[PDB]
């Protein structure tokens, strides 16, 4: 559903118009090849160019494809690889990689096989490209090419970019409509943020806050920020739209009340990878509840409202007794110095009533009043039923810890400690992370599951950011625009766009 002549929008500029570009981008390796999509694309697209290159780009590939092999898989896979890429005769052999490296991944293989055994190998390669290979890069015509996606990337972005449709879910501060981008026909959620409700109810630095958390984490377990623009009367958020549901709904609606363990396993990897990945900036989220886990296209989920969130200073802790009644770790509560223990306790609360079918301090067919509720979180030892194995048990009342100190995944290691729980031994999370395990359930498609001041101006230009690097680069490559607009000249010559005789 792209706008009729969206190539005259997404039209490059002529490779003159980047020369501010050019002196402005950092030339940082990660960051060019491998970070950014578009920038990734086109640095493997120079290596095909090359004969000695190319078989860089295609051992790594092969070894990405090694990592999220199945456990009785490994030892075929492992040596395909080897006789392949770090055999002497090979065509697409590796050299860089000294033979005192393809001689050692050798013993690797004469023995049980890890999913790293090439990770020695992956990076000796990384190494190499770093230094010759990426400083060509930069003086060859893809560079250009991609400094024109950048200037594409930061054009302005308005109400016009957008094409709005029907308002999909309402709450506090505005409400959250559905969008398109006229260009692309990608789909997102608008987050309306009513510009008079801001100013009035003085939170101001908390829709900050907010915006400023989404787009600095890329998940593919939290809500995405892919453009941040200003309007008349509202600022709006575009973020991932979640057309599948909530896990409150398919707790209690689809549910028994309640899923299956295995079921309840597979939505607690993804939120629990969707918290590490928040933790990774030192950012809380505090607002772990089951309609907040919502459910895509083709049933994986995402963290939702990232409204109560904020990053922790390194080494410092923060007080604040905040959130939803039933959802708050005890220190939260008692309105102590906490860091990212409540997340964790969340944790534990979602993992219980998915699998119970009932909050762990309140009855489903119980009524109770806040004060009851906040006695047991503190006071009261949750039980457990046969709905639960031995492990998830264990999982829960470990991440159900009143003291903060001892409460599973809040030491040093972090998210690896809940990772290695007995819980998730069945769970391989290198394939989720790659998208590779059918989700439990699928949505169908067709279901419905369900005033003139300054400092109000300084305000906006500090929100109103326009588009987001990495998610709008991957829009750009998931709608095949790229695919589409990344075009050269016939037999690898320059087209007229990169060439600086005509403009
Ligand atoms: C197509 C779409 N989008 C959604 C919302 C969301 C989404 O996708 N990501 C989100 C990320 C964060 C938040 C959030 O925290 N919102 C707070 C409350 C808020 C509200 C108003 C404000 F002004 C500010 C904050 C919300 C969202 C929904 C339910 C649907 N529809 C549907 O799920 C169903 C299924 C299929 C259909 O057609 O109906």
Known sequence: ?????????????????????????????????????????????????????????????????????????LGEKGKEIMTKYLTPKSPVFIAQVGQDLVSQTEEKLLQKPCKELFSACAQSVHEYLRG????????????????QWKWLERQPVTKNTFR??????????????????????????????????????????????????????????????????????????????MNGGDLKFHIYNMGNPGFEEERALFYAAEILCGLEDLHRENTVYRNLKPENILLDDYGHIRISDLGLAVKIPEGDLIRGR?????????????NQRYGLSPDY???????????????????????????????????????????????????????????????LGCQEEGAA?????????????????AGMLDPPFVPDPRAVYCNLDHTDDDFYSKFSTGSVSIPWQNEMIETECFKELNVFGPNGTLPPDLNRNHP
């Open 417 to 433: 400690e809940v990772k290695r729980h007995p819980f998730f031994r069945n769970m391989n999370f290198k394939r989720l992370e």
């Open 1 to 73: 559903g792209k706008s009729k002549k969206w190539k005259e929008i997404l039209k490059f500029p002529h490779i003159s118009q980047c020369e501010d570009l050019r002196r402005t981008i950092d030339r940082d390796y990660c960051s060019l090849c491998d970070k950014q999509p578009i920038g990734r694309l086109l640095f493997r697209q120079f290596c095909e160019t090359r004969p000695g290159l190319e078989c860089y780009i295609q051992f790594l590939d092969s070894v990405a494809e090694y990592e999220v092999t199945p456990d009785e898989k």
């Open 322 to 334: 905040v959130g939803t009644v039933g959802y708050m770790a005890p220190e939260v509560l008692n």
């Open 164 to 241: 709005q449709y029907r308002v999909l879910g309402k709450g506090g501060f505005g409400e959250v409509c559905a969008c398109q981008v006229r260009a692309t026909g990608k789909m997102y959620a608008c987050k309306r943020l009513e510009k008079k409700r801001i100013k009035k109810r003085k939170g101001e630095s908390m829709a900050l806050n907010e915006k400023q958390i989404l787009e600095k984490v890329n998940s593919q377990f939290v809500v995405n920020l892919a453009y941040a623009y200003e309007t008349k009367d509202a600022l709006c958020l575009v973020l991932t739209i």
């Open 132 to 147: 010759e290979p990426f400083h060509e890069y930069l003086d060859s015509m893809f560079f250009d090419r991609f400094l």
């Open 345 to 407: 306790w969340g944790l534990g609360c979602l993992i219980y009533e998915m699998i119970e079918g009932q909050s762990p301090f309140r009855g489903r067919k119980e009524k109770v009043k806040r004060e009851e509720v906040d006695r047991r979180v503190l006071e009261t030892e949750e039980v457990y039923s046969h709905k639960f194995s031995e492990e998830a048990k264990s999982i829960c009342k470990m991440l159900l810890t009143k003291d903060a100190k001892q409460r």
